[PDB]
């Protein structure tokens, strides 16, 4: 039934047919009597005599598939011995076809080939250097990939084998050199695949080569004589080494050379007019390099990648080669994602640089700066926004005079991200001109790519402006209603046409968050019906926009939206169970938003969601096990369901009973939900090798414990899951967790974040358990104290900050105050980082406040350090370390000094300390530190202490600012867009209503004494009465 295909292969007069049958014959080898030997020989003659290689290869592959099958038992024992013979033949063409046939056998993966590893090692050790056929040398390198996989299959790596295999690696490098010299780009790529497979190998096979392979790929990548496609192979290889063997790169300190190599390739000339008008190649060297810098920034420490880029920013930005100006800007835009914190600290350099880019004559440079700004905004959202007064005029001017479509898109996109995060009070100055400009722009531009960018920017105005968007609400929906007609009719629409509708659905729902239910009522019903139309549509992008609309609806209507659950939850369920492979990115994005919608619905529906809890947790749990890209988000939504249940049971955030629970402060039904998700959370952290998975779980557990207490991790006196959680978290601190193991080493920002989120488990358990935390804290304490000594500035900062917060959780029930206080004083006194000393001073005051032993010996040294730290922040104030840090250091130092005066007034000489305190008041940030200062003011004035009594005018002025700031906060609280309450606690001036009343009561007393000084101030006269 099968032999037919072979005969066509031998005989067909037309030559292509011989080949076409060979392709089919190989496929049909497995299914398909005494003369199986006659068919073997006919193939071998054809495979060494046929004229043209393609037919030769066609014959050879059929032979190999036969050999693997005819190796159930010893059915063809001479095949491998004959091929080994022919590969040593004097005729180079005979050797070439022999190695080709051996390669096909190796491609069969027949388990019996492992019987021959030493044969292959000996043969390929010779044929790899064959001086007659470069093709034969390349096939031998290709063959070596399979031989290595065989030696690793063995129980124990044969040491003799791996020494032979590693000895061959320089030979493969010699082949790579040869193929590049002869221009055989087909084989150059194949050798690059061989180099890529070495990355995955066990270190015993590769020797110490991997670092030198990287060095060599960089030599190839930077050399512009080499063909473009070959250089891409080299950039990709180094990018591949960052993923699979960054430990080797670190050992060679290759990060900076990689960064600089990628920087030089990125500066090469590109097609300017294509960049400017062609709406999105990453197979040209300069673009591939940007992927290299991006991956380098994610995998390595900012000292290895970010610092080299910033050191070259001044010379490249002023270069007369616009492509060097363009490069450094795009280098920054790709650095920000993996090194956000490092990038933020360089804003004193980067913000002016982006401004210079916007001012450039060359549009390619202007486009780069805008891409940089976009990237910065996405990543460090409000930080970029604060510089709007410089940006907005510059970006508007570019929009007004743009000559290319891609500059217009990125200028609108840059405006979108800036406005999205501008403070509510600052947007008010601009809101009317922006609004009229955006709608003037929406009218002019008919390209759906440009209209989508404008609609998003308009939605960002509403988001920032909150209630201040009401005057524009009706006219905006009137206009935008046109882009959401015929939602169901998705045929005859382009991809950009789909996106313009989807963005309109999403940003109209953002307007409901800005102007709330009352001003949204006019259009609620038609818009919700259209959103359901989108959910049923065959466009995943369109369904995704529908779920986004509903999620924001949940925020607007709360329980009032509950009658819609019965229809919507089944549409969400269908979305979450979709098959995820075409991967179909639209479905991944749709699944993410549907999951957000399901979480938002659960929170809002309250009691009405209970009948959906079990089913929702069933669907979500399945996605954690089987979904390819939704595990973290799916697990997060389970915890959101838990939050919905616990709030429905009227467990109020932060109102849980402290200490290890002997039983449960939650009813049996809610406890069963918690235990379910608590079980899945531990299962996805234990022996988990995805660090993003471990981070996500630790974040969810931290947030849930802070909100609802130890019942999240423990109940009924059983601490099995608590011990597991700390066992895992302690592993991450030691650097010994599975996600880590694939001591002083320099760490990436992701690696450091992993450290911080594990510390956050301890910080949250200490507030949960108070004195009951001491037992659990005993193992981590030595590790964390050791981390306070790291060569890493962020690690020292994380540990000291976490020790300070742990102190706050344990309060006076902490049996280690003396030991912790001693460590933090060393940090306060000797650390070279202002940020580290900043966090240290907070813990020092807390520890002193909670100490019950004699601290008279440490007051004087600590106070001297506290005045010196006021000295290093003073100089910095006048002209690594940001202004935010400096201002926080003043707040924390003053809080620490106040806590000490409060604790042991007799030990502190007030005549000099009170003015130092006053001179740094009012605060600019860290208003939590007012709490001890208000308390100190209360006590000093109650004792009619002379030092404060003479300072009444400064004290009155401080409270004028405090109450002025407090009312501004209350106005912002009511007018803001729904759900932007990220920093609600941080802008609070008072830590409690009780202390706020004491300050008011103190202010009234101050009015009688000092004869109405208090009421002279309009702010305080209002609060006094």
């Amino acid at each position: 039934a099968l032999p037919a295909l072979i005969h066509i292969l031998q005989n067909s007069s037309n030559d292509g047919i011989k080949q076409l049958a060979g392709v089919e014959a190989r496929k049909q080898v497995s299914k398909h009597a005494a003369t199986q030997t006659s068919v073997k020989q006919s193939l071998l003659n054809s495979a060494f005599n046929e004229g043209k290689d393609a037919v030769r290869h066609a014959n050879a592959r059929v032979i190999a598939s036969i050999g693997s099958e005819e190796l159930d038992e010893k059915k063809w024992p001479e095949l491998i011995p004959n091929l080994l013979q022919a590969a040593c033949d004097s005729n180079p063409k005979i050797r070439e076809t022999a190695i080709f046939i051996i390669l096909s056998l190796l491609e069969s993966f027949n388990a019996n080939l492992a019987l021959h590893i030493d044969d292959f090692l000996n043969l390929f050790a010779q044929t790899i250097n064959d001086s007659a056929s470069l093709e034969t040398r390349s096939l031998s390198a290709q063959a070596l990939s399979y031989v290595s996989s065989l030696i690793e299959e063995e129980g124990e790596i044969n040491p003799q084998y791996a020494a032979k295999f590693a000895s061959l690696i320089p030979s493969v490098v010699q082949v790579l050199d040869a193929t590049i010299r002869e221009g055989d780009t087909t084989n150059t790529k194949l050798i690059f695949n061989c180099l890529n497979d070495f990355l995955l190998l066990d270190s015993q096979l590769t020797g110490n080569t991997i670092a030198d392979l990287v060095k060599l790929a960089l030599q190839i990548a930077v050399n512009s004589d080499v063909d473009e496609d070959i250089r891409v192979f080299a950039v990709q290889f180094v990018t591949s080494a960052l993923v699979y063997r960054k430990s080797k790169i670190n050992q060679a300190k290759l990060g900076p050379e990689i960064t600089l190599a990628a920087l030089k390739v990125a500066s090469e000339e590109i097609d300017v007019e294509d960049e400017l008008t062609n709406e999105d190649e990453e197979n040209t060297p300069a673009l591939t390099a940007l992927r290299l810098i991006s991956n380098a920034s994610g995998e390595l420490s900012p000292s290895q990648v970010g610092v080299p880029i910033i050191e070259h920013l001044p010379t490249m930005l002023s270069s007369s080669n616009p492509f060097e100006r363009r490069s450094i800007l795009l280098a920054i835009s790709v650095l920000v994602t993996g090194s956000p914190d490092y990038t933020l600290s360089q804003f004193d350099k980067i913000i002016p640089a982006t401004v210079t880019g916007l001012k450039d004559s060359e549009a390619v440079v202007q486009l780069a700066a805008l891409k940089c700004i976009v990237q910065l905004s996405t990543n460090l959202q409000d930080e970029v926004a604060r510089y709007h007064e410089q940006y907005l005029p510059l970006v508007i001017d570019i929009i007004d005079s743009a000559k290319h479509v891609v500059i217009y898109k990125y200028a609108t996109l840059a405006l979108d991200g800036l406005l999205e995060f501008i403070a509510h009070n600052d947007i008010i100055k601009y809101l009317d001109p922006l609004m009229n400009k955006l709608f003037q722009m929406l009218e002019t531009q008919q390209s759906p790519k440009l209209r989508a960018a404008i609609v998003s920017a308009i939605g960002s105005c509403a988001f920032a402006a909150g209630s201040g968007f009401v005057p524009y609400f009706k006219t905006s929906v009137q206009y935008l209603q046109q882009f959401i007609q015929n939602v169901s009719q998705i045929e005859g629409l382009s991809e950009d046409d789909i996106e313009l509708k989807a963005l309109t659905f999403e940003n109209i729902s953002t307007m409901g968050r800005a102007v709330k239910s009352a001003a949204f009522a006019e259009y609620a019903e038609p818009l919700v019906n259209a959103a359901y139309e989108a959910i049923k549509t065959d466009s995943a992008r369109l369904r995704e926009s529908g779920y986004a609309f509903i999620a924001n609806m949940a925020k607007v209507y709360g329980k009032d939206f509950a009658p819609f659950l019965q229809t919507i939850i089944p549409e969400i369920f269908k979305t979450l169970e979709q098959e995820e492979y075409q991967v179909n990115t639209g479905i991944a994005y749709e699944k993410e938003v549907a999951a957000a919608a399901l979480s938002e619905l659960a929170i809002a529906s309250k009691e009405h969601f209970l009948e959906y809890v079990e089913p929702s947790l069933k669907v979500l749990a399945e996605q954690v096990n089987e979904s390819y890209g939704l595990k973290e988000t799916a697990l997060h939504s389970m915890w959101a369901i838990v939050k919905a249940v616990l709030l429905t049971a009227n467990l109020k955030e932060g109102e849980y009973p402290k200490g290890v629970p002997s039983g449960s402060y939650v009813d049996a039904s809610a406890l069963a939900v918690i235990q379910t998700v608590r079980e899945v959370s531990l299962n996805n952290v234990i022996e988990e090798v995805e660090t993003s998975m471990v981070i996500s779980v630790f974040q969810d557990l931290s947030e849930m414990l802070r909100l609802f207490g130890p019942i999240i991790i423990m109940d009924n006196g059983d601490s099995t899951h608590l011990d597991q959680l700390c066992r895992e978290a302690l592993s991450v601190l030691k650097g010994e967790h599975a996600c880590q193991t694939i001591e002083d080493l320099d760490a990436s920002e992701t690696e450091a974040t992993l450290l911080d989120v594990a510390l956050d488990i301890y910080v949250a358990l200490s507030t949960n358990l108070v004195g009951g935390f001491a037992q659990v804290f005993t193992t981590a304490k030595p590790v964390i104290l050791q981390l306070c000594q790291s060569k890493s500035k962020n690690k020292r900062s994380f540990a000291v900050g976490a020790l300070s917060e742990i102190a706050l959780g344990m309060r006076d029930e902490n049996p280690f105050i003396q030991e912790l206080l001693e460590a933090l004083i060393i940090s306060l006194t000797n650390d070279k980082s202002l940020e580290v000393r900043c966090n240290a001073s907070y813990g020092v005051g807390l520890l002193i406040e909670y100490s019950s032993f004699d601290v008279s010996a440490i007051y004087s040294p600590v106070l001297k350090s506290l005045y010196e730290i006021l000295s290093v922040a003073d100089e910095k104030n006048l002209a690594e370390a940001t202004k935010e840090i400096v201002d926080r250091t003043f707040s924390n130092v003053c809080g620490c000094v106040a806590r000490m005066i409060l604790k042991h007034q007799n030990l502190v000489p007030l005549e000099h300390t009170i003015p130092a305190l006053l001179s740094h008041l009012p605060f600019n940030t860290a208003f939590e530190e007012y709490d001890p200062i208000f308390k100190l003011f209360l006590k000093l004035f109650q004792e009619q202490n002379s030092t404060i009594i003479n300072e009444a005018p400064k004290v009155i002025a401080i409270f004028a600012t405090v109450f002025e700031k407090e009312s501004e906060r209350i106005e912002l609280e009511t007018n803001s867009t729904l759900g932007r309450e990220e920093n609600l606690e941080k802008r609070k001036q008072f830590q409690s209503e009780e202390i706020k009343q004491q300050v008011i009561e103190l202010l009234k007393h101050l009015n009688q004494q000092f004869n109405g000084a208090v009421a002279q101030n309009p702010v305080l006269a209002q609060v006094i009465a």
Partner: peptide, 11 residues
């Protein structure tokens, strides 16, 4: 990881 600091319109 302590006092010094370490979602939006989109979904």
């Amino acid at each position: 990881g302590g006092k010094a600091p370490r979602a939006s319109k989109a979904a």
